[PDB]
Amino acid sequence: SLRSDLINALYDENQKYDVCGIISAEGKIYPLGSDTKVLSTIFELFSRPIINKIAEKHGYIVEEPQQNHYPDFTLYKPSEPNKKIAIDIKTTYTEKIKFTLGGYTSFIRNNTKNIVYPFDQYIAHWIIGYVYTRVKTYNINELNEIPKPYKGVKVFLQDKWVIAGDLAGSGNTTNIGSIHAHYKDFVEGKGIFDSEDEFLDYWRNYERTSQLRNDKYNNISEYRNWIYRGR
Amino acid sequence: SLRSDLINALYDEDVCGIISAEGKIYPLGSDTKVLSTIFELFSRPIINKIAEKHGYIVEEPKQQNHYPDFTLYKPSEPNKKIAIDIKTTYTNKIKFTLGGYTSFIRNNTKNIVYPFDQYIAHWIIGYVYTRSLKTYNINELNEIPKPYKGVKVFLQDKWVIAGDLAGSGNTTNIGSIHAHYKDFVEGKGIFDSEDEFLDYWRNYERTSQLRNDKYNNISEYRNWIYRGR
DNA sequence: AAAGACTCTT
DNA sequence: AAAGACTCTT
C-alpha cells in the first residue's frame, strides 16, 4: 500500500543516508548546527522527494502549502478529491520522547482555519516522526569529514489520533501533546484514545488553561467520567 | 574593527539545497522556517572567521531557546560581550520581529546565555529575500531551482531599528520599524537612545486593553513619562 | 492593528 | 504539569 511503501522508503533512505550540510551553487558546503530548529528543517527537506516518488507510484498528486497552513503534504487521487491524506513531519530529540502534534484551536475546531483544504476532505492524518540523538566551510571532496550534530536517527509513520495524548504539548501555542513514551510505542501505536472520534472530541472540548480545566477535565480518565455523566 | 570587518565579509559572501554524505542533493523548500534556517547556517562560518581574526571567541547557546545566536568576547574582557542574532523576513517596506520583550530585557538571567548586563552590544544581522521534489547530483548544481530571487543583508544595532509596535502577539516580540532596506542600513529609527528603547519595552503591556490606559506608541509613551509614569 | 496561527524548558 | 520561552497572516 501507499503507507507500507512510504514507511519502507523512509526507513531505507534513513538507513543509507546522513545529511552533511547545505551546499552553494559554487560547491561550498556549510555544516549543520545543533538547534532542533535546524534539524526539523533538514528532515522535512530530506523527506520531500521520497514522499513524492512513492505517491506518484500510487497515482497520488502531492501539494505543499500558504504560510502557517497544515499539512506539510496533501495527497489525493484526481478522481477522489474528497479523500485526501495529510502528512506532517514532526521532530524531537533524545528514553521516553514526546512530540507536539499541532494546534488544537485551528482546523480541528474550524473546518477551514489554517489548513490547505477543508478538514472534512481529509480521510487520514499521518505523522512522520523523526527522533535524533543530539551530539569551517567544506569542499565536495570533504563530505565524509564534515561533523554532524546528531546520531541515531529513527523514523516512524503513524496516525495522528493514534499517538495523540491527553496533555497539551505547548501552553501559549495551544498544541496537542503526543503520548510520552518510547519510540517502539509510536511504531506499534500504543496510544490512549480508542477511536479517532474520541480523540477529536477530547481535543475539541479541551480548555486552554488548567483553571478552566479544573471544572471540566484534565486527562482521559476525567474526560470519560465527564462523558459518562452527561458532559 | 570587528564590526566593519564583519559587515564587509557579510556583503562579500547562493545556497541551493542540503547535501548528504553520499553526495545526493535535496532542493530547498518554500517554507518560512526553511530560509531562516539556511541564512543562520550560512552566517556561522563568516562570523567565526572574523571573530577569530580579532581575538574573540564565539559561543552558541547549548540549551535551545536562549538568546543570542552568537556571543562574542575576549577572555580578558568578559563584561564587554557582544550579542549577534540573525533575523529573516521576505519581500515580493519590510519589517522584522526582534526578539521577546518579556524575557532577558526584563529579567537579567532569563533565556539568555550570559546575564544581560555583560553585553555591551546587541547586533542584528537581517536577511531579506524576495520570494522541486527531486534530488540532484553534484554535477547538476547549476540546474537546481532556488525558492528566492534575490537576497539583501545588513548588520545594525538592535535599538536603532526597533519600532514602537509589537512584532507578534502571543509570542510577545519587539517589532522593528516598518521601512525600506535602506533605512535599516542607515539606522533611521524612532528611539532617541538605547536607554529609551529599553525603557519603552520593559514597560510595554501585552494586550491593547492594558495598553490603552498607558501607551501604545512613542508619542503616548513620551506623554506617559511627562505624567510621571 | 492587534491577536493568534505555525518545539523546548523549567 | 502547566505555563511561557524561541516569523507570518487574518
- B132/A119 Cα distance (integer angstroms): 26
Say how far residue A219 (Cα) sits from the centre of its chain: 22
Chain A residues in contact with B148 by the CB 8 A cut-off are none
Nucleotides of D under 7 A from a protein CB: 1-9
- Pairing between β-strand B70-74 and β-strand B57-59 as defined by DSSP bridges: antiparallel
Method: X-ray
Structural domains in chain B (count): 1
B78 CB neighbour count, 10 Å cutoff: 10
Q: Is B158 a catalytic residue?
A: no
Instruction: Count CB-CB contacts under 10 A for residue A210.
Output: 10
Q: Is B161 helix (H, G, I), strand (E, B) or coil?
A: helix
What's the gap in Å between the CA of A148 and the closest CA on chain B?
10
Residue recorded with cell 533524545? A94
Domain region containing B8: 1-229
CA distance to A12, B5, B180, B188, per residue, from B183 (Å):
50, 21, 6, 5
Euclidean distance between CA atoms B122 and B86, whole angstroms:
11
Task: Check if the beta carbon of residue B27 is closer than 8 Å to that of residue B17.
Answer: yes
Q: Is it true that the peptide bond before B75 is cis, omega within 30 degrees of 0?
A: no
Distance, C-alpha A206 to centroid of its chain = 21
Asked if A46 and B18 come within 8 Å (Cβ–Cβ), the reply is yes
- Closest C-alpha among B114, B120, B226, B194 to residue B202: B194
Q: C-alpha grid cell for residue B57?
A: 571567541
Q: Count CB atoms within 10 A of the CB of residue B226.
A: 8
Query: Pick from A20, A49, A173: which is nearest to B21 by CB?
Result: A20
Q: Where are the alpha helices (DSSP H) in B93-193?
A: 158-161, 181-186
Residue A87, all three cell numbers: 502528512
Measure, in angstroms, how far nucleotide D2 C1' is from residue A174 CA.
Answer: 11
Protein-nucleic contacts, chain B 6-35 to strand D, CB < 7 Å: 32
Whether residue B104 contacts residue B68, with contact meaning beta carbons closer than 8 Å, is answered with: no
Are B60 and B47 spatial neighbours (Cβ–Cβ below 8 Å)? no
Joined grid coordinates for residue A229 = 455523566
Is there a binding annotation on residue A185? no
Determine contact, residues B116/B85, Cβ cutoff 8 Å: no
Residues 6+ apart with CB under 8 A from A74: A62, A63, A64, A84, A85, A86, A87, A116, A117, A122
* Phi/psi at B73 (5° precision): -175, 155
Scan for cell 540532484, then name that residue: B136
Q: How many CB atoms lie within 10 A of CB A49?
A: 19
Q: Between B18, B48, B142, which is nearest A25 by CB?
A: B142
3-class DSSP state of A200: helix
For an interface test with A, the pick among B12, B13, B16, B19 (most A C-beta atoms closer than 10 Å) comes out as B19
Report how many Cβ contacts below 8 Å link chain A to chain B.
122
Angstrom distances, CA of residue B141 to CA of A43, A172, A189, B106, B145:
21, 42, 41, 47, 9
DSSP conformation class of A143:
T
CB atoms within 10 A of CB A107: 24
Cell representation of residue B104? 532577558
Q: What is the DSSP letter of A176?
A: E
A5 annotated as a binding-site residue: no
In whole angstroms, give the CA distance from residue B13 to residue B9.
6
The x, y and z cell numbers of residue A63, run together, are: 501539494
- One-letter amino acid identity for B172? T
Q: What is the largest CA-CA distance in chain B?
A: 68
Q: B24 and A17: CB-CB below 8 Å?
A: yes
CB atoms within 10 A of CB B178: 12
What are the helix (H) ranges across B53-193?
158-161, 181-186
**Which of A18, A37, A41 minimises the CB distance to B20?**
A18
| Closest-approach residue (CA) in chain B for A72 | B31
The answer to whether B126 and B91 have CB atoms below 8 angstroms apart is no
Is position A184 annotated as part of the catalytic site?
no
User: What radius of gyration, in Å, describes the C-alpha atoms of chain B?
Assistant: 19
- Which H or E run includes A185? helix A183-188
- What CA–CA distance (Å, rounded) separates B124 from B104? 16
Closest chain A residue to B23, measured at CA: A143
Specify the CATH number for the domain of residue A48: 3.40.600.10
Q: Is B199 annotated as a binding residue?
A: no
| Distinct helix (H) and strand (E) counts, chain A | 7, 10
